[PDB]
Structures are given as structure tokens and as C-alpha cells.
């Protein structure tokens, strides 16, 4: 279900009508999008990984 | 070296997969809606008698 919320599949998809829109902005994906590269960087800062 | 002589590089990694994703995935719908709005404004200005 959490992956369903992030990727907009399953129940996360909006209902379909012929004469109306099907746009859903992605909040969870964005919130995680800064968190990823916020967290990854300390492990890639130097040539040596273990001290 | 003894390996396959190819080097593979992803832009946006997808967890547990070879390939990557560009940023068009996130932007296609916004591009369409913005284009529609701009066309509407040009229609207002162009059709009216001046």
C-alpha cells in the first residue's frame, strides 16, 4: 500500500469520468525526493568509506 | 579485465533495477496543462475584433 501511494497505482489512482480530469499531484514522492539525496551524500563524501 | 566492456549509468536510480528515469515522468502532465492555458489566452486575444 505504501508503494501504491507513492507510485500512484492501485487505489491511489483517481476515478475516471469521460468529461472530467484525471490529474493527481504527487506529495509523497516529492517529500521523499528531497530526503533521499539529503541522506545519501554523507556516505559518498570521501574516497575511504570505513574508519 | 575479464568483464563485459560496457559501463551503465542511471540518472535517477530506480531501486533494484538497471535503468534510470529522467524527469519527464514527473513533468508531462504539467507541460500539457500549461500549454492548454497558453493556447486559451492566445485564442482570446486572436479571435476578438481589434
Amino acid at each position: 500500500e505504501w508503494n501504491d501511494l507513492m507510485r500512484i497505482e492501485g487505489k491511489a489512482k483517481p476515478p475516471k469520468v469521460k468529461g472530467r480530469s484525471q490529474v493527481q499531484p504527487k506529495l509523497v514522492r516529492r517529500q521523499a525526493e528531497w530526503r533521499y539525496s539529503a541522506l545519501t551524500e554523507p556516505f559518498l563524501g570521501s574516497n575511504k568509506l570505513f574508519k | 579485465d575479464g568483464k563485459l566492456p560496457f559501463v551503465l549509468i542511471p540518472y535517477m536510480p530506480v531501486k533494484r533495477d538497471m535503468y534510470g528515469e529522467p524527469d519527464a515522468e514527473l513533468l508531462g502532465d504539467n507541460q500539457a496543462v500549461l500549454g492548454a492555458v497558453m493556447r486559451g489566452m492566445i485564442d482570446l486575444l486572436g479571435r476578438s475584433a481589434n
Binding site: - | K3, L4, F6, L8, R16, D17, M18
Partner: protein, 51 residues
């Protein structure tokens, strides 16, 4: 999900007869091939900028 774990890889490229004759001993059976049948225009799946 790892390129190193792959068992095989296949790549297609354009080449002329002079390139093959550059290293003669590496290649065999050059005479049997017909060049007209295998050309960039005849093979459609190959994607190129050649007119």
C-alpha cells in the same frame, strides 16, 4: 539489477570491409558473406542517423 551479474550483452554497429581487413587473422569466412543483403538500410531494427 546488477550489470556485473548479467550473462550476456549484444551490440550492433556499422563497419566496412577495410575495418575487418585491418585485422585479418582475427576473422574467418569473409568470402562467404554477401554485403548487399546486410546493409544499414536493409536491417530496420538497427537505429542510426544515416540517410
Amino acid at each position: 539489477g546488477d550489470i556485473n551479474k548479467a550473462m550476456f550483452a549484444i551490440v550492433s554497429f556499422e563497419t566496412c570491409k577495410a575495418d575487418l581487413l585491418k585485422e585479418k587473422d582475427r576473422y574467418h569466412n569473409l568470402n562467404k558473406i554477401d554485403w548487399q543483403s546486410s546493409a544499414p538500410v536493409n536491417e530496420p531494427d538497427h537505429a542510426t542517423t544515416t540517410p
